[PDB]
Design an enzyme around this catalytic site. Sequence first.
Site, short mmCIF file in Angstrom:
data_model
loop_
_atom_site.label_atom_id
_atom_site.label_comp_id
_atom_site.label_asym_id
_atom_site.label_seq_id
_atom_site.Cartn_x
_atom_site.Cartn_y
_atom_site.Cartn_z
N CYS A 1 -28.07 -1.98 1.97
CA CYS A 1 -26.95 -2.63 1.29
C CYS A 1 -25.63 -2.09 1.79
O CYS A 1 -25.50 -0.90 2.07
CB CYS A 1 -27.05 -2.53 -0.22
SG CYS A 1 -28.32 -3.61 -0.89
N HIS B 1 -23.33 -2.94 -6.63
CA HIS B 1 -24.28 -1.95 -7.15
C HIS B 1 -24.13 -0.53 -6.57
O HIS B 1 -24.78 0.39 -7.05
CB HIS B 1 -25.73 -2.45 -7.04
CG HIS B 1 -26.18 -2.69 -5.63
ND1 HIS B 1 -26.09 -3.92 -5.02
CD2 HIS B 1 -26.74 -1.85 -4.73
CE1 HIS B 1 -26.57 -3.83 -3.79
NE2 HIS B 1 -26.97 -2.58 -3.59
N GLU C 1 -20.82 -9.83 -6.54
CA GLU C 1 -21.62 -8.70 -6.04
C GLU C 1 -20.89 -7.87 -4.97
O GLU C 1 -21.52 -7.22 -4.14
CB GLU C 1 -23.01 -9.19 -5.56
CG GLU C 1 -24.10 -8.12 -5.46
CD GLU C 1 -24.29 -7.29 -6.72
OE1 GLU C 1 -24.09 -7.81 -7.85
OE2 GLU C 1 -24.64 -6.10 -6.59
N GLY D 1 -31.73 0.62 1.07
CA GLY D 1 -30.89 1.46 1.92
C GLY D 1 -30.09 0.68 2.96
O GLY D 1 -29.37 1.27 3.76
#
Length: 182
Positions: A149, A42, A73, A147
Amino acid sequence: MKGPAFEFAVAMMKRNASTVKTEYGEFTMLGIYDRWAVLPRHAKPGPTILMNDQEVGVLDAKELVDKDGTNLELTLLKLNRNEKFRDIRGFLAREEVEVNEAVLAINTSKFPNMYIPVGQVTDYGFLNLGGTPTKRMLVYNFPTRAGQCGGVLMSTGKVLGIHVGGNGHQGFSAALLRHYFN
């Protein structure tokens, strides 16, 4: 005990981790070998990223999926820089590892040089992350905030995964398997 995991985590972050900004936010980024690094999917890196507040070109990017097509992911990205990363592929497990003691390391402008003792890591495998079926998910108790990740999940002598999500109670890492970097 927790000390040796923290010891390993701090040394790893110092040598291999950086702070990255994309158009979608700010992330911790781990360099793996040569010019290949890893981000949460992401983060969606564009042709240029900010790496430690400096513009760096992206030469190639790969949004990883399993042989069945299921989302992992993770995005691998190759950086347009002369310096190579220290090769840490030997610190990656060949399969998903569960541990009793892990440390999550975060390094962004909002969470600078922070380390969290997360305790036990459980392999949940196939999960649904915000609508998206995702596999090789490692789960740990964590009062999660956004914040974080790209955070690097580690135990003594092993990089276990990359933090890709949370729900305020549990945190979620994508397992960082060695064969991803063949």
